[PDB]
């Protein structure tokens, strides 16, 4: 049920993600960005009133994050909308230029 179009950025740096997330001061706000290392993404998110980043590693057709693994990035995000990602924080508010304009 997570929708990549609402949170995914193919081309966005860490600094740009931070500038976006500063504008929506809600824990659980997040976006996902491709990194310029192969088979790598970052989830940039707010938790504990701060902006943090975690890496997601692709291996073959699956993506890995800590003790967890999924058939797609969309499925990983779906899972962490239902289960906590960082301490008690779940992914809650997908952030994009569209969201921010509103």
């Amino acid at each position: 049920q997570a929708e990549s179009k609402e949170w995914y950025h193919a081309s966005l740096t860490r600094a740009q993600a931070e500038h976006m997330l500063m504008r929506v001061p809600r824990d659980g706000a997040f976006l996902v960005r491709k990194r310029n290392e192969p088979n790598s993404y970052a989830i940039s998110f707010r938790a504990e009133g701060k902006i943090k980043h975690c890496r997601v590693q692709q291996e073959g057709q699956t993506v890995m994050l800590g003790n967890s693994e999924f058939d797609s990035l969309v499925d990983l995000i779906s899972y962490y909308e239902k289960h906590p990602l960082y301490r008690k924080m779940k992914l809650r508010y997908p952030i994009n230029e569209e969201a921010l304009e509103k």
Binding site: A42, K52, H53, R55, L65, G66, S68, Y86
Partner: peptide
């Protein structure tokens, strides 16, 4: 952690 944190 460093520049990136570990997920649960």
């Amino acid at each position: 952690p460093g520049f990136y944190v570990e997920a649960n």
